[PDB]
Every structure is written in structure tokens, then in C-alpha cells.
Amino acid sequence: LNEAKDNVKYLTTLEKFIEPLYNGTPQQIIDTLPALMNAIKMIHTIARFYNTTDKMTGLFIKITNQMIKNCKDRILNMIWEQDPAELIEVLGSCIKLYCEYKKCYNDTKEKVADMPKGKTFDFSDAQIFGKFDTFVRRLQKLIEIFSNIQQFNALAKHNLEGMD
Amino acid sequence: SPNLCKSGPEIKQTEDKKAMEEFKNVKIE
């Protein structure tokens, strides 16, 4: 009761708000990401164990899995049926969201480099081989596929007098 | 005389053709 009440009382200072799972627009997913990565900066007063650096990396891969759940949810409503226009918009906005994730998670990794400076006693080796790597490669494939589709649409409209 | 007129595309589709030329400009860009 003592250690658990202790560890839990130190984890209390988490500012959770379920923005990502209730977002329906890439703008909402983005400004969600700043919100979560600004609430996360309270890494310090949290307890060593429940906030173990490896457990933090696990919560990171879980945040990315929730992020990719929401990404598939917003993509459901459909770039492979709809015309190049919604594809341009959604691809642009999803790339902006990915850059936002990358950079805000780089600031959070600055916090993860803050952690050892005072806690060099133990380290949690980089376990970056998660589903997020594979599916971010998948999203890169989608980006390139659909951007080249975009440019080819106009280029084919320039090439052959038989447009159709 | 065989090259006189085509009689369907030249007449009222010609303004559309000039719009299509402007489209070819947007294509040039």
C-alpha cells in the first residue's frame, strides 16, 4: 500500500485529455499532438518505476498506435476513391501532422535525454523497432505513390491528345 | 470538296475549343 500509493501519487501529475481518439480532422489530430506533448513535459516529478524510461518508450509506441488508429479512422472517410483534390489536401495535412509528431517527439526525446543526465545510473536502450517504423514507411509509400499519381495526372493531361 | 466542313465540332464547340486552348495554357504552366 505504501509503495503503490507512493508510485501512484507521483504518477498523478499527468494531464490527459482524449483529443486524438475524438478528433475527426487532421487539424484536430495535430493540435492534439502539441497538447499531449506539452502535457507530457511533466515527466520529472513522476515516479522512477511507473515512469521507467523503457515504460516511457512503450507509452510512446502506444501513443503512436492510438495516433495511427485515428489516422486510419480519418483516412477511412477515402483517398483511393476520391479525386486528386482531397488526396492533395489529406496528404499535405497528414505530412504536416507527421512532421509535427516527429519534431514534438524530438522535443520529448530532448526530455528523454534530460532523464539520464540526472539518472545516468540506469539506461533503457533504444527499442525503436516498433510497428510505427513499419507503418511510417507505409505512409511514406502512400505519400510517394499518391504524389506521383498527382503529377502524372497533369502530365498525362499534357502528353497525349487522347486525354481519356 | 471532301475537306469542306465537318459540320458538328467546328460550329458550336469552337468557343469550347478556345477555352480548351486556354486550358492548354494552364497546362503549359
Side-chain angles (χ1 to χ4, degrees), chain A residues 48-136:
Chain A
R48 57 94 184 173
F49 185 64
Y50 288 166
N51 201 3
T52 303
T53 316
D54 195 59
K55 303 190 174 188
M56 205 58 249
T57 301
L59 198 146
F60 283 157
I61 307 297
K62 284 205 315 292
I63 283 184
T64 313
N65 289 341
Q66 168 178 102
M67 170 69 42
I68 203 53
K69 187 176 184 179
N70 301 312
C71 199
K72 192 58 174 181
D73 296 325
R74 61 176 196 182
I75 289 285
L76 170 68
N77 198 30
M78 197 58 93
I79 63 193
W80 69 99
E81 282 83 352
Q82 308 163 298
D83 289 332
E86 179 263 355
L87 175 52
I88 291 280
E89 185 278 344
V90 172
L91 192 62
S93 45
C94 81
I95 294 173
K96 311 322 167 263
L97 164 75
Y98 171 75
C99 310
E100 282 303 313
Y101 173 83
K102 183 178 170 183
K103 306 329 168 291
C104 71
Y105 177 66
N106 291 170
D107 288 347
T108 320
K109 186 194 179 183
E110 286 175 1
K111 319 278 176 176
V112 178
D114 302 343
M115 178 56 62
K117 177 182 74 70
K119 289 303 188 180
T120 39
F121 287 115
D122 294 309
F123 289 103
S124 72
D125 43 357
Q127 289 188 355
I128 303 296
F129 305 96
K131 277 185 188 176
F132 86 112
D133 192 66
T134 301
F135 198 94
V136 158

Coordinates of all heavy atoms in Angstrom, one line a residue, chain A residues 48-136:
Chain A
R48 N 10.0 7.0 -10.4 CA 11.0 6.3 -11.2 C 10.5 5.1 -11.9 O 10.7 4.8 -13.1 CB 12.2 6.0 -10.3 CG 11.8 5.1 -9.1 CD 12.0 3.6 -9.4 NE 11.6 2.8 -8.2 CZ 11.5 1.5 -8.3 NH1 11.9 0.8 -9.4 NH2 11.1 0.8 -7.2
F49 N 9.6 4.3 -11.2 CA 9.3 3.0 -11.7 C 8.2 3.0 -12.8 O 8.4 2.6 -13.9 CB 8.9 2.1 -10.6 CG 8.7 0.7 -11.0 CD1 9.7 -0.1 -11.5 CD2 7.4 0.1 -10.9 CE1 9.5 -1.4 -12.0 CE2 7.2 -1.2 -11.4 CZ 8.2 -1.9 -11.9
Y50 N 7.0 3.6 -12.4 CA 5.9 3.7 -13.4 C 6.3 4.6 -14.5 O 5.8 4.5 -15.6 CB 4.7 4.2 -12.7 CG 4.0 3.2 -11.8 CD1 3.0 3.6 -10.9 CD2 4.3 1.8 -11.8 CE1 2.4 2.7 -10.0 CE2 3.7 0.9 -11.0 CZ 2.7 1.3 -10.1 OH 2.1 0.4 -9.3
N51 N 7.3 5.5 -14.3 CA 7.9 6.3 -15.3 C 9.2 5.9 -15.8 O 10.1 6.7 -16.2 CB 7.9 7.8 -14.9 CG 8.0 8.8 -16.0 OD1 8.0 8.4 -17.2 ND2 8.1 10.0 -15.7
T52 N 9.5 4.5 -15.7 CA 10.7 4.0 -16.2 C 10.9 4.4 -17.7 O 9.9 4.4 -18.5 CB 10.7 2.5 -16.1 OG1 10.5 2.1 -14.7 CG2 12.0 1.9 -16.6
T53 N 12.1 4.7 -18.1 CA 12.4 5.2 -19.4 C 11.9 4.2 -20.5 O 11.4 4.6 -21.5 CB 13.9 5.5 -19.6 OG1 14.4 6.2 -18.4 CG2 14.1 6.4 -20.8
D54 N 12.1 2.9 -20.3 CA 11.6 1.9 -21.2 C 10.1 1.9 -21.2 O 9.4 1.8 -22.3 CB 12.1 0.6 -20.9 CG 11.9 -0.4 -22.0 OD1 12.4 -0.2 -23.1 OD2 11.3 -1.5 -21.7
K55 N 9.4 2.1 -20.0 CA 8.0 2.2 -20.0 C 7.5 3.5 -20.7 O 6.4 3.5 -21.2 CB 7.5 2.1 -18.5 CG 7.9 0.9 -17.8 CD 7.3 0.7 -16.5 CE 7.6 -0.6 -15.8 NZ 6.8 -0.9 -14.6
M56 N 8.4 4.5 -20.6 CA 8.0 5.7 -21.4 C 8.1 5.5 -22.9 O 7.2 6.0 -23.6 CB 9.0 6.9 -21.0 CG 8.4 8.3 -21.2 SD 6.9 8.5 -20.3 CE 5.7 8.6 -21.6
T57 N 9.1 4.7 -23.3 CA 9.1 4.4 -24.7 C 7.9 3.5 -25.1 O 7.4 3.6 -26.3 CB 10.4 3.7 -25.1 OG1 11.5 4.5 -24.7 CG2 10.5 3.3 -26.5
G58 N 7.5 2.6 -24.2 CA 6.3 1.8 -24.5 C 5.1 2.7 -24.6 O 4.2 2.5 -25.5
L59 N 4.9 3.6 -23.7 CA 3.8 4.6 -23.8 C 3.9 5.4 -25.1 O 2.9 5.9 -25.6 CB 3.8 5.5 -22.5 CG 2.4 6.2 -22.3 CD1 2.2 6.3 -20.8 CD2 2.4 7.6 -22.9
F60 N 5.1 5.7 -25.5 CA 5.3 6.4 -26.8 C 4.8 5.6 -28.0 O 4.1 6.1 -28.8 CB 6.8 6.7 -27.0 CG 7.2 7.9 -26.2 CD1 8.6 8.0 -25.9 CD2 6.3 8.8 -25.7 CE1 9.0 9.1 -25.1 CE2 6.8 9.8 -24.9 CZ 8.1 10.0 -24.6
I61 N 5.2 4.3 -28.1 CA 4.7 3.4 -29.1 C 3.2 3.3 -29.0 O 2.5 3.2 -30.0 CB 5.4 2.1 -29.1 CG1 6.9 2.3 -29.1 CG2 5.0 1.3 -30.3 CD1 7.4 3.0 -30.4
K62 N 2.6 3.3 -27.8 CA 1.2 3.3 -27.6 C 0.5 4.5 -28.1 O -0.6 4.5 -28.7 CB 0.8 3.0 -26.2 CG 1.0 1.5 -25.8 CD 0.1 1.2 -24.6 CE 0.2 2.3 -23.6 NZ 1.5 2.4 -22.9
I63 N 1.1 5.7 -27.8 CA 0.6 7.0 -28.3 C 0.6 6.9 -29.8 O -0.4 7.4 -30.5 CB 1.4 8.1 -27.8 CG1 1.0 8.5 -26.3 CG2 1.3 9.4 -28.6 CD1 1.8 9.7 -25.8
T64 N 1.6 6.4 -30.4 CA 1.7 6.3 -31.9 C 0.7 5.3 -32.4 O 0.2 5.5 -33.5 CB 3.1 5.9 -32.3 OG1 4.1 6.7 -31.6 CG2 3.3 6.2 -33.8
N65 N 0.4 4.3 -31.7 CA -0.6 3.3 -32.1 C -2.0 3.9 -32.1 O -2.9 3.7 -33.0 CB -0.6 2.0 -31.3 CG 0.6 1.2 -31.6 OD1 1.3 1.4 -32.6 ND2 1.0 0.3 -30.7
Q66 N -2.3 4.7 -31.0 CA -3.5 5.5 -31.0 C -3.6 6.5 -32.1 O -4.6 6.7 -32.8 CB -3.7 6.2 -29.6 CG -4.7 7.2 -29.5 CD -4.8 7.8 -28.1 OE1 -4.3 8.9 -27.9 NE2 -5.4 7.1 -27.2
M67 N -2.4 7.2 -32.4 CA -2.3 8.1 -33.5 C -2.6 7.4 -34.8 O -3.3 8.0 -35.7 CB -0.9 8.7 -33.5 CG -0.6 9.5 -34.7 SD -1.5 11.0 -34.8 CE -1.4 11.6 -33.1
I68 N -2.2 6.2 -35.0 CA -2.4 5.5 -36.3 C -3.8 5.0 -36.4 O -4.3 4.9 -37.5 CB -1.3 4.5 -36.5 CG1 -1.2 4.2 -38.0 CG2 -1.6 3.2 -35.8 CD1 -0.9 5.5 -38.8
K69 N -4.4 4.6 -35.2 CA -5.8 4.3 -35.2 C -6.6 5.5 -35.7 O -7.4 5.3 -36.6 CB -6.2 3.9 -33.8 CG -7.6 3.4 -33.6 CD -7.9 3.0 -32.2 CE -9.3 2.4 -32.1 NZ -9.5 2.0 -30.7
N70 N -6.3 6.7 -35.2 CA -7.0 7.9 -35.6 C -6.7 8.2 -37.1 O -7.6 8.7 -37.8 CB -6.7 9.0 -34.7 CG -7.1 8.7 -33.3 OD1 -8.2 8.3 -33.0 ND2 -6.1 9.0 -32.4
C71 N -5.5 8.0 -37.5 CA -5.1 8.2 -38.9 C -5.9 7.3 -39.8 O -6.4 7.8 -40.8 CB -3.6 8.0 -39.1 SG -2.9 8.7 -40.6
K72 N -6.0 6.0 -39.5 CA -6.9 5.2 -40.3 C -8.3 5.6 -40.2 O -9.0 5.5 -41.3 CB -6.7 3.7 -39.9 CG -7.3 2.7 -40.8 CD -6.7 2.8 -42.2 CE -7.2 1.7 -43.2 NZ -6.6 1.8 -44.5
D73 N -8.8 6.1 -39.1 CA -10.2 6.5 -39.0 C -10.5 7.7 -39.9 O -11.5 7.7 -40.6 CB -10.5 6.8 -37.5 CG -10.4 5.7 -36.6 OD1 -10.7 4.5 -37.0 OD2 -9.9 5.8 -35.4
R74 N -9.6 8.7 -39.9 CA -9.8 9.8 -40.7 C -9.6 9.5 -42.2 O -10.3 10.1 -43.1 CB -8.9 11.0 -40.3 CG -7.4 10.7 -40.4 CD -6.5 11.8 -40.0 NE -5.2 11.6 -40.5 CZ -4.2 12.5 -40.3 NH1 -4.4 13.6 -39.6 NH2 -2.9 12.2 -40.7
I75 N -8.7 8.6 -42.5 CA -8.4 8.2 -43.9 C -9.6 7.4 -44.4 O -9.9 7.4 -45.6 CB -7.1 7.4 -44.0 CG1 -5.9 8.4 -43.8 CG2 -7.0 6.7 -45.3 CD1 -5.6 9.3 -45.0
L76 N -10.3 6.7 -43.5 CA -11.5 5.9 -44.0 C -12.5 6.8 -44.7 O -13.0 6.5 -45.8 CB -12.2 5.3 -42.7 CG -13.5 4.7 -43.0 CD1 -13.5 3.5 -43.8 CD2 -14.2 4.4 -41.6
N77 N -12.7 8.0 -44.1 CA -13.6 9.0 -44.8 C -12.8 10.0 -45.5 O -13.1 10.4 -46.7 CB -14.5 9.6 -43.8 CG -15.7 10.3 -44.4 OD1 -16.2 9.9 -45.5 ND2 -16.2 11.4 -43.8
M78 N -10.5 8.4 -47.5 CA -11.1 7.7 -48.6 C -10.4 8.1 -49.9 O -11.0 8.3 -50.9 CB -12.6 7.9 -48.7 CG -13.3 6.9 -49.6 SD -13.1 5.2 -49.1 CE -14.5 4.9 -48.0
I79 N -9.1 8.3 -49.8 CA -8.3 9.0 -50.9 C -8.3 8.1 -52.1 O -8.0 8.6 -53.2 CB -6.9 9.4 -50.5 CG1 -6.1 8.1 -50.1 CG2 -7.0 10.4 -49.3 CD1 -4.8 8.5 -49.4
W80 N -8.5 6.8 -52.0 CA -8.3 5.9 -53.1 C -9.6 5.9 -54.0 O -9.4 5.5 -55.2 CB -7.9 4.5 -52.7 CG -9.0 3.7 -52.0 CD1 -9.8 2.7 -52.5 CD2 -9.3 3.7 -50.6 NE1 -10.6 2.2 -51.5 CE2 -10.3 2.8 -50.3 CE3 -8.8 4.5 -49.5 CZ2 -10.9 2.6 -49.1 CZ3 -9.4 4.3 -48.2 CH2 -10.4 3.3 -48.0
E81 N -10.7 6.3 -53.5 CA -11.9 6.5 -54.4 C -12.0 8.0 -54.9 O -12.3 8.2 -56.0 CB -13.2 6.2 -53.7 CG -13.5 4.7 -53.7 CD -12.8 4.0 -52.5 OE1 -11.9 4.7 -51.9 OE2 -13.0 2.8 -52.3
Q82 N -11.7 8.9 -54.0 CA -11.9 10.3 -54.3 C -10.8 10.9 -55.2 O -9.8 10.3 -55.4 CB -12.0 11.1 -53.0 CG -13.0 10.6 -52.0 CD -12.8 11.1 -50.6 OE1 -11.8 10.8 -49.9 NE2 -13.8 11.7 -50.0
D83 N -11.1 12.0 -55.8 CA -10.3 12.6 -56.8 C -9.0 13.1 -56.3 O -8.8 13.1 -55.0 CB -11.1 13.7 -57.5 CG -12.2 13.2 -58.4 OD1 -12.1 12.0 -58.9 OD2 -13.2 13.9 -58.6
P84 N -8.0 13.5 -57.1 CA -6.7 14.0 -56.6 C -6.8 15.2 -55.6 O -5.9 15.5 -54.9 CB -6.0 14.5 -57.9 CG -7.0 14.3 -59.0 CD -7.9 13.2 -58.6
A85 N -8.0 15.9 -55.5 CA -8.0 17.1 -54.7 C -8.0 16.8 -53.2 O -7.1 17.3 -52.5 CB -9.3 17.9 -55.1
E86 N -8.9 16.0 -52.8 CA -8.9 15.5 -51.4 C -7.6 14.8 -51.1 O -7.1 14.9 -49.9 CB -10.1 14.6 -51.0 CG -10.1 14.1 -49.6 CD -9.6 12.7 -49.5 OE1 -9.2 12.1 -50.6 OE2 -9.5 12.2 -48.4
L87 N -7.0 14.1 -52.1 CA -5.8 13.5 -51.9 C -4.7 14.5 -51.6 O -3.9 14.3 -50.7 CB -5.4 12.6 -53.1 CG -4.0 12.0 -53.1 CD1 -3.8 11.2 -51.8 CD2 -4.0 11.1 -54.3
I88 N -4.6 15.6 -52.4 CA -3.7 16.6 -52.1 C -3.8 17.2 -50.7 O -2.9 17.3 -50.0 CB -3.8 17.8 -53.2 CG1 -3.4 17.3 -54.6 CG2 -3.1 19.0 -52.7 CD1 -1.9 17.3 -54.8
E89 N -5.1 17.5 -50.3 CA -5.3 18.1 -49.0 C -4.9 17.2 -47.9 O -4.2 17.5 -47.0 CB -6.8 18.6 -48.9 CG -7.0 19.3 -47.6 CD -7.3 18.4 -46.4 OE1 -7.5 17.2 -46.6 OE2 -7.2 18.9 -45.2
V90 N -5.4 15.9 -48.0 CA -5.2 15.0 -46.9 C -3.7 14.6 -46.8 O -3.1 14.4 -45.7 CB -6.1 13.7 -47.1 CG1 -5.7 12.6 -46.1 CG2 -7.5 14.1 -46.9
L91 N -3.0 14.4 -48.0 CA -1.6 14.1 -48.0 C -0.8 15.2 -47.4 O 0.1 15.0 -46.6 CB -1.2 13.8 -49.4 CG 0.2 13.1 -49.4 CD1 0.1 11.8 -48.6 CD2 0.7 12.9 -50.8
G92 N -1.1 16.5 -47.8 CA -0.4 17.6 -47.2 C -0.6 17.7 -45.7 O 0.4 17.8 -45.0
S93 N -1.8 17.6 -45.3 CA -2.1 17.7 -43.8 C -1.6 16.5 -43.0 O -1.1 16.7 -41.9 CB -3.6 17.8 -43.6 OG -4.3 16.9 -44.4
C94 N -1.6 15.3 -43.6 CA -1.0 14.2 -42.9 C 0.5 14.3 -42.8 O 1.1 13.9 -41.8 CB -1.5 12.9 -43.5 SG -0.5 12.4 -45.0
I95 N 1.1 14.8 -43.9 CA 2.6 15.1 -43.8 C 2.9 16.1 -42.8 O 3.9 16.0 -42.0 CB 3.1 15.4 -45.2 CG1 3.0 14.2 -46.1 CG2 4.6 15.9 -45.1 CD1 3.4 14.6 -47.6
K96 N 2.1 17.2 -42.7 CA 2.3 18.2 -41.7 C 2.1 17.6 -40.3 O 2.9 17.9 -39.4 CB 1.3 19.4 -41.8 CG 1.2 20.0 -43.2 CD 2.5 20.0 -44.0 CE 2.3 20.3 -45.4 NZ 2.3 19.1 -46.2
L97 N 1.1 16.7 -40.1 CA 0.9 16.0 -38.8 C 2.1 15.1 -38.5 O 2.5 15.1 -37.4 CB -0.3 15.2 -38.8 CG -0.4 14.2 -37.7 CD1 -0.7 14.8 -36.4 CD2 -1.4 13.1 -38.0
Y98 N 2.7 14.5 -39.5 CA 3.8 13.6 -39.3 C 5.1 14.5 -38.9 O 5.8 14.1 -38.0 CB 4.1 12.8 -40.5 CG 5.5 12.0 -40.3 CD1 5.6 11.0 -39.5 CD2 6.6 12.5 -41.0 CE1 6.8 10.3 -39.3 CE2 7.8 11.8 -40.8 CZ 7.9 10.8 -40.0 OH 9.1 10.1 -39.8
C99 N 5.3 15.6 -39.6 CA 6.4 16.5 -39.2 C 6.1 17.0 -37.8 O 7.1 17.1 -37.0 CB 6.5 17.6 -40.2 SG 6.6 17.1 -41.9
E100 N 4.9 17.4 -37.4 CA 4.6 17.8 -36.1 C 4.9 16.7 -35.1 O 5.5 17.0 -34.0 CB 3.1 18.2 -36.0 CG 2.9 19.6 -36.5 CD 3.7 20.7 -35.9 OE1 3.8 20.7 -34.7 OE2 4.3 21.5 -36.6
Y101 N 4.5 15.5 -35.3 CA 4.8 14.4 -34.5 C 6.3 14.2 -34.3 O 6.8 14.1 -33.2 CB 4.2 13.1 -35.0 CG 4.6 11.9 -34.2 CD1 4.0 11.5 -33.0 CD2 5.7 11.1 -34.6 CE1 4.4 10.4 -32.3 CE2 6.1 10.0 -33.9 CZ 5.5 9.6 -32.8 OH 5.9 8.5 -32.0
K102 N 7.0 14.2 -35.5 CA 8.5 14.0 -35.4 C 9.1 15.0 -34.6 O 9.9 14.7 -33.7 CB 9.0 14.0 -36.9 CG 10.5 13.8 -37.0 CD 10.9 13.8 -38.5 CE 12.4 13.8 -38.7 NZ 12.7 13.8 -40.1
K103 N 8.8 16.3 -34.8 CA 9.5 17.4 -34.1 C 9.1 17.5 -32.6 O 10.0 17.7 -31.7 CB 9.3 18.7 -34.8 CG 9.7 18.7 -36.3 CD 10.8 17.7 -36.7 CE 10.9 17.6 -38.2 NZ 9.7 16.8 -38.7
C104 N 7.8 17.3 -32.3 CA 7.4 17.4 -30.9 C 7.9 16.1 -30.1 O 8.3 16.2 -29.0 CB 5.9 17.5 -30.8 SG 5.0 16.0 -31.2
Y105 N 8.0 15.0 -30.8 CA 8.6 13.8 -30.2 C 10.1 14.0 -30.1 O 10.8 13.4 -29.3 CB 8.3 12.6 -31.0 CG 8.9 11.3 -30.4 CD1 8.6 10.9 -29.2 CD2 9.9 10.7 -31.1 CE1 9.2 9.8 -28.6 CE2 10.5 9.5 -30.6 CZ 10.2 9.1 -29.4 OH 10.8 8.0 -28.8
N106 N 10.7 14.8 -31.0 CA 12.1 15.1 -30.8 C 12.4 16.0 -29.6 O 13.4 15.9 -28.9 CB 12.7 15.8 -32.1 CG 12.8 14.8 -33.2 OD1 13.0 15.2 -34.4 ND2 12.6 13.5 -32.9
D107 N 11.4 16.9 -29.3 CA 11.5 17.7 -28.1 C 11.2 16.8 -26.9 O 11.9 16.9 -25.8 CB 10.5 18.8 -28.1 CG 10.9 20.0 -29.0 OD1 12.0 20.0 -29.4 OD2 10.0 20.8 -29.3
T108 N 10.3 15.8 -27.0 CA 10.1 14.9 -25.9 C 11.3 14.0 -25.7 O 11.6 13.5 -24.6 CB 8.8 14.0 -26.2 OG1 7.8 14.9 -26.7 CG2 8.3 13.4 -24.9
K109 N 12.0 13.7 -26.8 CA 13.3 12.9 -26.7 C 14.4 13.8 -26.1 O 15.3 13.3 -25.5 CB 13.7 12.4 -28.1 CG 14.9 11.5 -28.0 CD 15.5 11.2 -29.4 CE 16.7 10.3 -29.3 NZ 17.4 10.1 -30.6
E110 N 14.3 15.1 -26.3 CA 15.1 16.0 -25.5 C 14.8 15.9 -24.0 O 15.7 15.9 -23.2 CB 14.9 17.5 -26.0 CG 15.5 17.8 -27.3 CD 15.2 19.2 -27.8 OE1 14.5 19.9 -27.0 OE2 15.7 19.6 -28.9
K111 N 13.6 15.7 -23.7 CA 13.2 15.4 -22.3 C 13.7 14.0 -21.9 O 14.1 13.8 -20.7 CB 11.7 15.4 -22.1 CG 11.0 16.6 -22.8 CD 11.2 17.9 -22.0 CE 10.6 19.1 -22.7 NZ 10.6 20.3 -21.9
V112 N 13.7 13.0 -22.8 CA 14.3 11.7 -22.6 C 15.8 11.7 -22.5 O 16.4 10.8 -21.9 CB 13.8 10.7 -23.7 CG1 14.4 9.3 -23.5 CG2 12.3 10.6 -23.7
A113 N 16.4 12.7 -23.0 CA 17.9 13.0 -22.7 C 18.1 13.8 -21.5 O 19.2 13.8 -20.9 CB 18.5 13.7 -23.9
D114 N 17.0 14.6 -21.1 CA 17.0 15.2 -19.7 C 17.0 14.1 -18.6 O 17.7 14.3 -17.6 CB 15.8 16.1 -19.6 CG 15.7 17.2 -20.6 OD1 16.8 17.4 -21.3 OD2 14.6 17.7 -20.8
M115 N 16.3 13.0 -18.9 CA 16.2 12.0 -17.9 C 17.5 11.4 -17.4 O 17.8 11.3 -16.2 CB 15.2 10.9 -18.4 CG 15.1 9.7 -17.5 SD 14.5 10.1 -15.9 CE 12.9 10.8 -16.3
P116 N 18.4 10.9 -18.4 CA 19.6 10.3 -17.9 C 20.6 11.2 -17.2 O 21.3 10.8 -16.2 CB 20.2 9.7 -19.2 CG 19.2 9.8 -20.2 CD 18.4 11.0 -19.8
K117 N 20.7 12.5 -17.6 CA 21.6 13.4 -17.0 C 21.5 13.4 -15.5 O 22.5 13.6 -14.8 CB 21.4 14.9 -17.5 CG 22.3 15.9 -16.9 CD 22.0 17.3 -17.4 CE 20.7 17.8 -16.8 NZ 20.8 18.1 -15.4
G118 N 20.3 13.2 -15.0 CA 20.1 13.1 -13.5 C 20.0 11.6 -13.1 O 20.0 11.3 -12.0
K119 N 19.7 10.7 -14.1 CA 19.5 9.3 -13.9 C 20.4 8.5 -14.8 O 20.0 7.5 -15.4 CB 18.0 9.0 -14.0 CG 17.1 9.5 -12.9 CD 17.6 9.0 -11.6 CE 16.6 9.4 -10.5 NZ 17.0 8.9 -9.1
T120 N 21.7 8.8 -14.8 CA 22.7 8.0 -15.6 C 22.9 6.6 -15.0 O 23.5 5.8 -15.6 CB 24.0 8.7 -15.6 OG1 24.3 9.4 -14.4 CG2 24.1 9.7 -16.8
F121 N 22.3 6.4 -13.8 CA 22.5 5.1 -13.1 C 22.0 3.9 -13.9 O 22.7 2.9 -14.0 CB 21.9 5.1 -11.7 CG 22.6 5.9 -10.7 CD1 21.9 7.1 -10.2 CD2 23.8 5.6 -10.3 CE1 22.6 7.8 -9.2 CE2 24.5 6.4 -9.3 CZ 23.8 7.5 -8.8
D122 N 20.9 4.1 -14.6 CA 20.3 3.1 -15.5 C 19.9 3.7 -16.8 O 19.6 4.9 -16.9 CB 19.1 2.4 -14.8 CG 19.5 1.6 -13.6 OD1 20.4 0.8 -13.6 OD2 18.9 1.8 -12.5
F123 N 20.0 2.8 -17.8 CA 19.6 3.3 -19.2 C 18.6 2.3 -19.8 O 18.6 1.1 -19.4 CB 20.8 3.4 -20.1 CG 21.7 4.6 -19.8 CD1 22.9 4.4 -19.1 CD2 21.3 5.8 -20.1 CE1 23.7 5.4 -18.8 CE2 22.2 6.9 -19.9 CZ 23.4 6.7 -19.2
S124 N 17.8 2.8 -20.7 CA 16.9 1.9 -21.4 C 17.3 2.1 -22.9 O 17.0 3.1 -23.5 CB 15.4 2.3 -21.2 OG 15.1 3.5 -21.8
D125 N 18.0 1.1 -23.4 CA 18.4 1.1 -24.8 C 17.3 1.4 -25.8 O 16.2 1.1 -25.5 CB 19.1 -0.2 -25.2 CG 18.3 -1.4 -24.7 OD1 17.3 -1.2 -24.0 OD2 18.7 -2.6 -25.0
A126 N 17.7 2.0 -26.9 CA 16.7 2.4 -27.9 C 16.0 1.1 -28.4 O 16.7 0.2 -29.0 CB 17.3 3.1 -29.1
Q127 N 14.7 1.0 -28.2 CA 13.9 -0.1 -28.7 C 13.0 0.3 -29.9 O 11.9 -0.1 -30.0 CB 13.1 -0.7 -27.5 CG 13.9 -1.4 -26.5 CD 13.0 -2.2 -25.5 OE1 11.8 -2.0 -25.5 NE2 13.6 -2.9 -24.6
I128 N 13.6 1.1 -30.8 CA 12.8 1.6 -31.9 C 12.9 0.6 -33.0 O 13.7 0.7 -33.9 CB 13.4 3.0 -32.3 CG1 13.4 4.0 -31.2 CG2 12.7 3.6 -33.5 CD1 12.1 4.4 -30.7
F129 N 12.0 -0.4 -32.9 CA 11.7 -1.3 -33.9 C 10.2 -1.7 -33.9 O 9.8 -2.8 -34.3 CB 12.6 -2.6 -33.7 CG 14.1 -2.3 -33.6 CD1 14.7 -2.2 -32.4 CD2 14.8 -2.2 -34.8 CE1 16.0 -1.9 -32.3 CE2 16.2 -1.9 -34.7 CZ 16.8 -1.8 -33.5
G130 N 9.4 -0.7 -33.5 CA 8.0 -0.9 -33.3 C 7.2 -0.8 -34.6 O 7.7 -0.6 -35.7
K131 N 5.9 -1.1 -34.5 CA 5.0 -1.0 -35.6 C 5.0 0.3 -36.3 O 4.7 0.5 -37.5 CB 3.6 -1.4 -35.2 CG 3.3 -2.9 -35.1 CD 1.8 -3.0 -34.8 CE 1.5 -4.5 -34.5 NZ 0.0 -4.6 -34.1
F132 N 5.3 1.4 -35.5 CA 5.3 2.7 -36.0 C 6.3 2.9 -37.1 O 6.1 3.6 -38.1 CB 5.5 3.7 -34.9 CG 6.9 4.0 -34.5 CD1 7.4 5.3 -34.8 CD2 7.7 3.1 -33.9 CE1 8.7 5.6 -34.5 CE2 9.0 3.4 -33.6 CZ 9.5 4.6 -33.9
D133 N 7.5 2.3 -37.0 CA 8.5 2.4 -38.1 C 8.0 1.8 -39.4 O 8.0 2.4 -40.4 CB 9.8 1.7 -37.6 CG 11.0 2.0 -38.6 OD1 11.4 3.1 -38.6 OD2 11.4 1.0 -39.3
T134 N 7.4 0.5 -39.3 CA 6.9 -0.1 -40.5 C 5.8 0.7 -41.1 O 5.8 0.9 -42.3 CB 6.5 -1.5 -40.1 OG1 7.6 -2.3 -39.6 CG2 5.9 -2.2 -41.4
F135 N 4.9 1.2 -40.3 CA 3.7 1.9 -40.9 C 4.1 3.3 -41.3 O 3.4 3.9 -42.2 CB 2.5 1.9 -40.0 CG 1.2 2.2 -40.7 CD1 0.4 1.1 -41.1 CD2 0.8 3.5 -40.9 CE1 -0.7 1.4 -41.8 CE2 -0.3 3.7 -41.6 CZ -1.1 2.7 -42.1
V136 N 5.1 3.9 -40.7 CA 5.6 5.2 -41.2 C 6.2 5.0 -42.5 O 6.1 5.8 -43.4 CB 6.5 5.9 -40.2 CG1 7.3 6.9 -40.8 CG2 5.6 6.5 -39.1

